[PDB]
Amino acid sequence: STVELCGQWDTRTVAGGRYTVSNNVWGAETAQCIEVGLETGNFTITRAEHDNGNNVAAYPNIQFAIPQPRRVQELSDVRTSWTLTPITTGRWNAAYDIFFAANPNHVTYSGDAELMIWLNKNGDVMPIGSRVATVELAGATWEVWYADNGAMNVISYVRTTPTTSVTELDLKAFIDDAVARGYIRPEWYLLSVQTGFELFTGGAGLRSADFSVTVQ
């Protein structure tokens, strides 16, 4: 079965409790609906009236919360698959968002990080931060962007060739690279892995499907 979520902060648990799908209109009050498949977690943005400037309006997403606390240094394998369906209009990206914290029990200033992996976009949208490098990871080339705003590092990897599909993408390769760069500490905990669309203007018709995450 399916359901349409139109509330700003609506969420649903899907896929046998493994993932959560959220509307997540956090940066605007403009309307948005997603239609969610409750067995798969697949979703289609059916409504999106956003018209933001340089800041994100919304990030509807599917999330895997790590079930038991795990330090980056304790991970052996992190894999993910995903298929997106792009549209020809609007300003949006298709991006993973991975969160790390020193302390699962309390916010830690400068001890928290956000790692993004951009697979696709439309319009003039760019990451938060400065462009610092290019790297070869997981069979492809990525621009590396870095922001040290204050409380939280943002590290973004932007695929130089846009795509709509990844299968068994090695997320640990990205984690290991950010560790090599000093942006993530090995003792930090991996909290969650999300993917979806950062919406700036429009977004209706974007589709997320076939999401899977393995953390060993």
Chain-wise SSE layout:
Layout: E1 2-5, E2 11-14, E3 19-22, E4 32-37, E5 43-48, E6 61-65, E7 78-85, E8 91-101, E9 112-122, E10 130-137, E11 140-148, E12 153-159, E13 165-170, H1 171-181, E14 189-201, E15 207-215
Parallel strand pairs: 9-12
Antiparallel strand pairs: 1-4, 2-3, 3-6, 4-5, 5-15, 6-14, 7-13, 7-15, 8-9, 8-14, 10-11, 11-12
Description of the structure:
The longest helix has 11 residues. With 216 residues, the chain is mainly beta. The radius of gyration is 16 Å and the shape is globular. It has 1 helix and 15 strands, in the order E-E-E-E-E-E-E-E-E-E-E-E-E-H-E-E. A 9-stranded mixed β-sheet has the order 2-3-6-14-8-9-12-11-10, covered by helices on one side. It has a single domain, classed as Glycoside hydrolase family 11/12, catalytic domain (Jelly Rolls), CATH 2.60.120.180.
Core attributes:
globular, Jelly Rolls, nine-stranded mixed beta sheet, mainly beta, 1 helix, six-stranded antiparallel beta sheet, 216 residues
